[PDB]
Amino acid sequence: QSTYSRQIKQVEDDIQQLLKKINELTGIKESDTGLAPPALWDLAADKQTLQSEQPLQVARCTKIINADSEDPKYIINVKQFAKFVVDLSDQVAPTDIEEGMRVGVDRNKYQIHIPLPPKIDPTVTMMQVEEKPDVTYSDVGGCKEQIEKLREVVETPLLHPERFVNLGIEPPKGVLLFGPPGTGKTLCARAVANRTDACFIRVIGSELVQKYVGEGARMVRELFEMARTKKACLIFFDEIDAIGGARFDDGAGGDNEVQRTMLELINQLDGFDPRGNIKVLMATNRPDTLDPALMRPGRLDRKIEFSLPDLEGRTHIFKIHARSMSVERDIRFELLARLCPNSTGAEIRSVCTEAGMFAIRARRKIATEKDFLEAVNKVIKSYAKFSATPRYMTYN
Amino acid sequence: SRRYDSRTTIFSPEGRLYQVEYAMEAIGHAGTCLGILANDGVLLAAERRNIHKLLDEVFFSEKIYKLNEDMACSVAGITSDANVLTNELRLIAQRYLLQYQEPIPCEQLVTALCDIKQAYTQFGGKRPFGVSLLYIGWDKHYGFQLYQSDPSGNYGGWKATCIGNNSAAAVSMLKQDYKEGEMTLKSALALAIKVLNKTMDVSKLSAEKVEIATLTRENGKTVIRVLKQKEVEQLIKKHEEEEAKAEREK
Amino acid sequence: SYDRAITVFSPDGHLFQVEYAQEAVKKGSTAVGVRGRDIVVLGVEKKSVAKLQDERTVRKICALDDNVCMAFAGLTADARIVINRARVECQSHRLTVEDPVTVEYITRYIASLKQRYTQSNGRRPFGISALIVGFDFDGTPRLYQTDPSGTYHAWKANAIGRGAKSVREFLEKNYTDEAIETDDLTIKLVIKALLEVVQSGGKNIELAVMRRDQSLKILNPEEIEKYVAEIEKEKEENEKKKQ
Amino acid sequence: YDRGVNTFSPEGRLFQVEYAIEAIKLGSTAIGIQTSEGVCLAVEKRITSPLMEPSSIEKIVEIDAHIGCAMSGLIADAKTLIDKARVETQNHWFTYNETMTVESVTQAVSNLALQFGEEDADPGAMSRPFGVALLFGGVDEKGPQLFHMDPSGTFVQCDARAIGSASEGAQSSLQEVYHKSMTLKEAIKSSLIILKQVMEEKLNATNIELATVQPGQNFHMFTKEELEEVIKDI
Amino acid sequence: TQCRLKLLKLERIKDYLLMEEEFIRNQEQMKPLEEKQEEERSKVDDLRGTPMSVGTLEEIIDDNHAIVSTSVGSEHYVSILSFVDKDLLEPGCSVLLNHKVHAVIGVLMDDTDPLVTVMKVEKAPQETYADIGGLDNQIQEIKESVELPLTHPEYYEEMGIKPPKGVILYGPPGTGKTLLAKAVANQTSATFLRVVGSELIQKYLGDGPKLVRELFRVAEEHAPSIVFIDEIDAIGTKRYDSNSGGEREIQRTMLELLNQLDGFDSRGDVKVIMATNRIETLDPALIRPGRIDRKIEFPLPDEKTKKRIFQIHTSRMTLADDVTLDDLIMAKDDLSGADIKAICTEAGLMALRERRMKVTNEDFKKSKENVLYKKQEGT
Ligand SMILES: Nc1ncnc2c1ncn2[C@@H]1O[C@H](COP(=O)(O)OP(=O)(O)OP(=O)(O)O)[C@@H](O)[C@H]1O
Ligand SMILES: Nc1ncnc2c1ncn2[C@@H]1O[C@H](COP(=O)(O)OP(=O)(O)OP(=O)(O)O)[C@@H](O)[C@H]1O
Ligand SMILES: [Mg+2]
């Protein structure tokens, strides 16, 4: 098409003129911004130089000598690691800054000025905060007591706290999820993670194993310091077996490091510490290993088992995963569930993939009744040779 | 108790029997031991695994046992287990003689042992017998034979085989040089010194480092003699005079 | 002594020992079996010979009785222990009942010997599968197949051991009554099926036929090379249906 | 990680026995309906090829001329039970001279159900529970009766049971279609309707076994001809 | 066609933009617009100042202030200045502070990772499939698990089914697991990370989970990526003493891999390929369906296949005429495509001791006899 081949010439070349002139009248690159609004920012930065208190050198209060006296004094401990007796703020009321509180001072005359933003210590812990994943409570089958237990103790007390205080009770804090691998301990938590709409802070069991003695325990400590401030959190200790251990002595200090971190976790959900109002999920798959003092009610009040689904469940779960793909008219999903023995929810995810594959491998546009019986043969029989469920099911 | 049980009679996830499989590797360390069939008799060659200046020899052979009047065998593996299997063989072969009043057929003697080696891998929870054997023999249904049993309980006839240290290297050398038929007992001893010389890393063999025992038929009775040091020393000189005349091409 | 429980139930509801013995079959050699109307042909693939072994001691097709033969695929060790007890049984039955064993009955006893071993103390399962083949007291052909579990079904055709899933896929389409109408067509059906899972031609397929009331003949290597020439001749006269 | 063969679950019941129950859910389907006219047993063969003879599969076996049986689960383990049943019923006929009540036979078979024992027994006892559930249906002096016997030794009389890989599904469709006033021809037709939904391949004359046991007859398995006649009606 | 009917409107958008910028530059200071911008940019290098001190952003205060840590480690509550993309200010990031005023002029630099130079590879692996002889099932599931979903993402979407997530290649050593890895690294032109399973054990405690964390992160930054783990057995079988806590620390390393392979953190478009030859010694939960979906197995080659392999390495050579390929193949048995290439390589070398280019039937006899003692000795 000479007409439309000619159109294609200047459809590339003219859009390239567009970009050319865009750059001729904006121009960006390895430059820090888009440079479009910050040109005026520049003229506010000339007011940031006049801002002479800035820079402000940051320290921490450690000891107030006088408070009732006309002249409060403080003992600042700065970052050059020399300590100063200092005056009070030049305006901020001397009621605000107690000892411990991290506080910024001026660098010339170490005059305390601006209270912080304490507990810097949270640097790794910072990153455990979450940004809502993409699974909802319909995408989960076997909706028996399973998911109605969990909502009851973790979601309902945060949406309707009036009905638990009118009765005069106090709902339970923690909830242990445990089951054979691939039965929706995480899925059921990916679920509550977004729908809850309250601060959600999941730590990965292994990320609390640190290098230096009692740094692990510090990690835990900082984690609850941060969660007590944010009023009403969840903490979701995923796959705790690391730092999930059980006390024991033998030989040369076996696991004495990891073990001590656990004692700190234990200690902050049961010590004296009343603690704010933070719920806690723990999803293992090996509950047999958890220390008894970590497991008993008042730290993990409700234990939810995720047993393998039954016939009725399976039938449900096939619908949850297959409904999304194109299938011929009449698939006996109830026959693919008689045909499954004790299967994980994650085994059935895999079946549907392969029924799709044979349809793709053979170039057809629709999976048939045959394609499942065939893909259900492949994924269960063969691959069941090396399954988790057999062995991993006693630790459950 | 159950904690201290090894469970030696049980399958692997893969479809093996680990103890019988390890027992093979224990045989790959024993002395080399090869056997060659001919038309005019058959012969076992084995290298003395233990040799030393102080060590003595009292017995006609330190690896060849006579199981009968008509059969001998050589062992390879755990020497201790070999004193057990060779005593049951002798007792089997007399218990055959006590019924049928004949010398026992070559094949049967082996299977009758391989029911005992095979039992141990299937129940009882003892460790298996870590031995493989070569049986040279003579019977009136097949003439000379050679056989090889494993700790599994598998046996086979062979016309020329090897078991124990560097077995696969011997067998590669036999596949090439051994003729189907056309073997005299003179020629087999040439092949047996040549194969043994290649799987052992010594510069040359010595009449005091090997043991060659033949099994011949002379006058309707069987004879099983072990070559003295002089008879083997001849064979070693005639092989060096075939390496001196295996450079006449350049 | 050594009263332990080797085979116990999984938590998934299997028996891992009898499922692991299933793998000791799959590491075996292919054997097939088709039954004609006057002739039953079972062939074992691979003599396993290395130009040094005898073909008289590597045989995998033994004969329980006179009308009953059996091919196996698994651990050669175990198979010889079953075959023995089977041969005893085959004579114990001639003593107490005048007729010779039927082919169902010597099977139900091989199977029932393998089932007891997966439910007794001390013992691991027998790691063999079997094709029991024979003729009844009525000239009828029969083909039975066991496995470590100790179950047994009859077949019209069947393959066990290595590469048996492929060979069953070839016998579904090729076993009709346009084949196995003659003694020459039934032998050619077996060979044509092992040629799909042997990678060295026909000079590697030991093949035994049994014919009505006569005893088991093992076909010497010459006759098998003649039959392999008729196969390869027939895949060049399928070029008259491609033109 | 290993334990005994005789360990209790801290829950409260025997590890193995709780497991051997799961081995049933792998097995074929059987349906037994008890009437005043007789007992019918229907069990699907579940052939796996077209090369198998749909006849050397036996999942209904005669125990005597008035006590049928249907196995689901590991059909290999039934071989030992069935043969104890027969030799039980015969011994009871050789001493007391008279048939045996169906209940008594099933009791005598259930006494083996718990009998494994890694040690402190013979070098011949079982090592593991039996992997098989039974449906003894017979006719004696109480009229027809049908018993269900699982690997727990707990046997119990039923008016209509289903076992196997469609125990859940079929059991619910029996509760809607069963009632005291039936005849034998209504039941054989009722069961094969339930058995036609829960199978995986089409219902031929080569995919089930029917048997019946009636007051005025023996145990009588239907042949391939007679089956054509009751699948025509459906 | 329509695309230029679209252009005719896109240009007008730009011509209008040109009206505004071309007039407002001359309304600004009778000069080009980039000349006014350059007046400003040089003036920003007056604000910016010289030098520029690198530091650490520790935390952000919403108020456009931030606590940074200079070289000394002394923290300063500074202000976030002009010309800074606040979306490039995450914790741990390197910032440019004023040497004198200490205020973040910004992260105007491409801070580098020295771990990506180890994990990523700018390869061109010569071996493509078609150089993998006679293992053809193996060659495909893979294409359905890795390469095909990147070439034709419309098949899986049209069917309505997620593409399968990860594969395990497992079999006897030598058969061709890593050779298939080379093949698919070549083709897909996704970023191809590669870490051996042993590298997941290092001296100091705790680094195991840390190295594992930062391997995925790398592969996430560069999505779409492939993460191959050659010989994942070595994590869980051979040990090295260096590590502390022994086997317990090995586990927590694995539990980390095991999470960040499935876990909670909504990842995407990172294929996984785990090779191994001991698969029976892997924590099942690791290879749980839905964590890894396809277990390709690599059996020893057939006889006719073993001939296509020995026919493929010899193709670049010149063989003497007395060489019978079929006599050397069957001569031995149970060969891996590694053993085949090892007999080819040796013999070709014997020809280079003689200064020829004809591998003779005897070069292969010496060779085959030096790879058999090789297989026989050192066992
Ligand atoms: N009840 C269920 N309904 C729907 N999908 C399920 C269910 N159970 C498991 N799955 C499927 O299994 C996949 C993985 O499950 P999940 O990872 O939550 O199991 P897990 O208990 O976290 O196992 P692991 O111990 O390996 O972390 C999910 O993505 C989901 O598709
Ligand atoms: N099937 C085959 N076809 C062609 N070449 C092969 C084949 N198998 C192996 N090779 C050759 O052997 C070489 C090494 O093999 P490869 O790296 O695949 O072994 P591997 O199976 O990964 O062993 P390991 O278990 O040690 O990882 C390859 O570079 C290739 O040239
Ligand atoms: Mg999880």
Ligand SMILES: [Mg+2]
């Ligand atoms: Mg490799």
